[PDB]
Design a protein around this nucleic acid. Structure first.
Ligand SMILES: [Zn+2]
Length: 803
DNA sequence: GTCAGGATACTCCTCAATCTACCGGAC
DNA sequence: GTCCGGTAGATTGAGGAGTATCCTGAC
């Protein structure tokens, strides 16, 4: 097949005849090219590249150019390869020695279609772009290293000051646009279409750039200009969904395909617009859109896959390739290799899914029979972006890591599983004998660093910074390893290296507090966010440095830090939550979703929803107004006066809240017998109208109960947030415990408490309830009497406890 | 014969969120 | 013998990014 691949090119017959003539010496010491490299040049570079590499072989290698055989093939195997090979020979000495470019950067420029043109254009414009527009050598090379690099370089030279000054486009965004093929066209299109897309279509400059920053930016932008109002008005898609499709490579093709297939996929195939857009918003969107359009029924009716599984497979780059591979290969992996269809889909639903699927098909027998891996381990490695690369690396490298360095197969698999597993595996092979000897790290510590996403980067960064962090700042090597042991370890390590002395000298944090923040997944993000927000939270909201660190030192620290700064005003001033309680929520992982969900339910919820949300999160007893006797009405007035609450709020059945006086509420609780009084020890009193006044069904989480007193007073309790003074009690936070403690504080000698819990009352209530009760008091605990138990030593019957 | 542009597929690195086990008193 | 409350380690999903191959049109 490779011979045909050459024969069908513009110089196919000539390249094959020339290659056979010169292969005798291309395989020699000067280059030592193998069969793939020899045909690769003939296929892509053609006859001129084949003759050029041979004829100039004595200058390309063994000369001050130091252009290795692999770099020669990379340059030769392009249209115009002969031209790039001569040009890199002429300019490489100058670009490196005079302009300071790394030989790898010059080769990266040479290894493109039109490499000669990019090489000469960089030689001319590099000092101009750097000195006139502030573009670093890395940015100019990034522009140059493309097909048509010359055109991207010249266009940036002309258009950067126009886009920056006329439209406010950041110079880095101009480079980002010119960082792919067609950079000239994307820049010109942005200049032409920004007035239209931002004014007529209502798109932001960031959205226009995001589209332009991909390959085919001109085509995606022009297509959005035409199709966005059609997709929005005819099919009910939001501008964000149209841009999201356009913001992937090949956006034009996905946009037109959605317009054509969306009404068919929804009406005939039963897919939602969100599923179609999700498929469309990728590279090769149109391919997989049409692929499901035709394979969806087949995979469902013949292969037994659900629409959700097929859409999931289609939602990754190259979705068509994973879809077609599953079509033909699923019955082989599940029958010849015995894999569960869910495992094959799990592999298929990845970037490069076709490659992981085909690799398992051919490689699973080797990893299991030769290297001793289980099918679950091989699938686990396969089900990741780049799974093919990790699988091949394990096959060849595992016995070297195990036999030469003493690692277990499980440690190799653990490294292999993560995205970039190939890179972490090779990096451990190189650095493991250095890290464990030059710095004295334990091999388990190096593996712990390696077994993370981006492990290669953390391994190299520890090798560089470990002897500096432990000396310039005095950190313990264990602290550096701990920082390195999370995804993105390089980023946390570099941030600590530069930022620790600032957080200590300016913000007053200890090195241990800086490490505690750094040792997370979002380490760099939490570290930099604390630097900016700590004095703002402390001065604006009265937080201590310890509270800011407590929020930062978790997963999602940046998100919790900003959310607390954002939501504290409304959470405390409007909803009556204590700032410490908002911090307590933020101190947990996922702090922001928790506070946003609390905000949403407290803002748009009904009186019943706000009562449950506030009581479960804040903690307070609730007194129901159904009993309107003078004795209980006076109890409420007396309890309030003793506390002097700062705010009083009335909550209407529809969820709206008004600021009220105490006198108004005291009248309402007497007249309104469909209401509940919430007495927050923080100094916040609510009156809720229009609630259920009952116990919701037990849903397997925080539950409810009611305490009924002799005089008819009914006190509602929730489980969960208990009394800090009794933390050491294993019944703390239970309805029976809150009832017994309520009776103690209120000198109640008799009460009965009812709760809904279909799993039974836990055994801890059987002795601790009497302890919490004051001497002489009796509490009757009544189960729902609709279930027995879900554990041992549970109470399914009414029991009385006396203090 | 090179060169510019577009579409498509694959691989590597960071960041949150969520999801399970641990781990702790005290009748 | 939780309806509790951290703690560290383990998936699960999503987005930005650098790397790679292929085709088509115009000279
Ligand atoms: Zn209990």
């Amino acid at each position: 097949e490779a011979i045909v691949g050459v024969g069908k090119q513009w110089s196919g017959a000539r390249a094959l005849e020339a290659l056979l003539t010169v292969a005798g010496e291309l395989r020699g010491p000067p280059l030592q090219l193998d069969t793939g490299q020899l045909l690769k040049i003939a296929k892509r570079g053609g006859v001129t590249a084949v003759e050029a590499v041979h004829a100039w072989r004595n200058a390309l290698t063994g000369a001050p150019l130091n252009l290795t055989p692999e770099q020669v093939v990379a340059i030769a195997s392009h249209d115009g390869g002969k031209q790039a090979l001569e040009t890199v020979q002429r300019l490489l000495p100058v670009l490196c020695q005079a302009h300071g470019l790394t030989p790898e950067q010059v080769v990266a420029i040479a290894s493109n279609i039109g490499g000669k043109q990019a090489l000469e254009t960089v030689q001319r414009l590099l000092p101009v772009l750097c000195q006139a527009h502030g573009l670093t050598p890395e940015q100019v090379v990034a522009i140059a290293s493309n097909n048509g690099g010359k055109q991207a370089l010249e266009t940036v030279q002309r258009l950067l000051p126009v886009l920056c000054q006329a439209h406010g486009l950041t110079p880095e965004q101009v480079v980002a646009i010119a960082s792919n093929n067609g950079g000239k066209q994307a820049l010109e299109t942005v200049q032409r279409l920004l007035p239209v897309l931002c004014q007529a279509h209502g798109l932001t400059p960031e959205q226009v750039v995001a589209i332009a920053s991909n390959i085919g930016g001109k085509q995606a932008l022009e297509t959005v200009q035409r199709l966005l109002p059609v997709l929005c008005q005819a099919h009910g898609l939001t501008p964000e969904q149209v841009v999201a499709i356009a913001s992937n490579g090949g956006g034009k093709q996905a946009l037109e395909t959605v317009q054509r297939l969306l009404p068919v996929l929804c009406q005939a195939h039963g897919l939602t617009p969100e599923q179609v857009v999700a498929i469309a918003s990728n590279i090769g969107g149109k391919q997989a859109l049409e692929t499901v359009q035709r394979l969806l029924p087949v995979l469902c009716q013949a292969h037994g896959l659900t629409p959700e599984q097929v859409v999931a497979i289609a939602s990754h780059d190259g979705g068509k390739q994973a879809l077609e591979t599953v079509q033909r290969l699923l019955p082989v992996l599940c029958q010849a290799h015995g894999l569960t269809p869910e495992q094959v889909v799990a592999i298929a639903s990845n970037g490069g899914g076709k490659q992981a699927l085909e690799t398992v098909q051919r490689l699973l027998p080797v990893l299991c029979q030769a290297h001793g891996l289980t099918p679950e381990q091989v699938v686990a490695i396969a089900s990741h972006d780049g799974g093919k690369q990790a699988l091949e690396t394990v096959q060849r490298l595992l016995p070297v890591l195990c036999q030469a360095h003493g690692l277990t197969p499980e440690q190799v698999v653990a490294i292999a599983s993560h995205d970039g597993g190939k890179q972490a595996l090779e990096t451990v092979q190189r650095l493991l004998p250095v890290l464990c000897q030059a710095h004295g790290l334990t091999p388990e510590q190096v593996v712990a660093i390696a077994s993370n996403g981006g492990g290669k980067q953390a391994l190299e960064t520890v090798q560089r910074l470990l002897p500096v962090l432990c000396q310039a700042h005095g950190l313990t090597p264990e602290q550096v390893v701990a920082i390195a042991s999370h995804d993105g370890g390089k980023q946390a390590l570099e941030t600590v290296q530069r930022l620790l002395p600032v957080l200590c000298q300016a913000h007053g944090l200890t090195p241990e507090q800086v490490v505690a923040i750094a040792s997370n997944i979002g380490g760099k993000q939490a570290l930099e966010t604390v630097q900016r927000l700590l004095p703002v939270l402390c001065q604006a909201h009265g937080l201590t440095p310890e509270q800011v660190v407590a929020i930062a030192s978790n997963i999602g620290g940046k998100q919790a830090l900003e959310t607390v700064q954002r939501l504290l005003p409304v959470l405390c001033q409007a909803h009556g939550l204590t700032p410490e309680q908002v911090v307590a929520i933020a101190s947990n992982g996922g702090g922001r979703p928790a506070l946003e969900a609390l905000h949403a339910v407290l803002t748009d919820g009904s009186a019943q929803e706000r009562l449950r949300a506030l009581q479960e999160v804040a903690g307070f007893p609730v007194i129901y107004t159904e009993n309107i006797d003078e004795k209980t009405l006076e109890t409420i007035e007396k309890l309030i006066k003793k506390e002097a609450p700062g705010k009083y709020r009335l909550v209407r059945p529809d969820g709206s809240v008004e600021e009220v006086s105490l006198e108004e509420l005291l009248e309402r609780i007497k007249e309104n017998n469909s209401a509940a009084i919430a007495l927050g020890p923080s100094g916040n009193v609510w009156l809720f109208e229009g609630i259920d006044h009952s116990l919701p069904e037990y849903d397997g989480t925080t539950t409810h109960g009611v305490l009924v007193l002799d005089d008819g007073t009914q006190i509602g309790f929730t489980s969960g947030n208990g009394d800090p003074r009794y933390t050491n009690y294993r019944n703390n936070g239970h309805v029976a415990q809150k009832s017994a403690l309520y009776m103690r504080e209120n000198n109640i000698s008799n009460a009965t408490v009812y709760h809904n819990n279909t799993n039974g009352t836990c055994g801890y209530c059987n002795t601790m309830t009497a302890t919490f009760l004051p001497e002489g008091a009796t509490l009757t605990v009544v189960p729902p009497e609709n279930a027995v138990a879900n554990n041992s030593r549970a109470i399914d019957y009414v029991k009385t406890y006396t203090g």
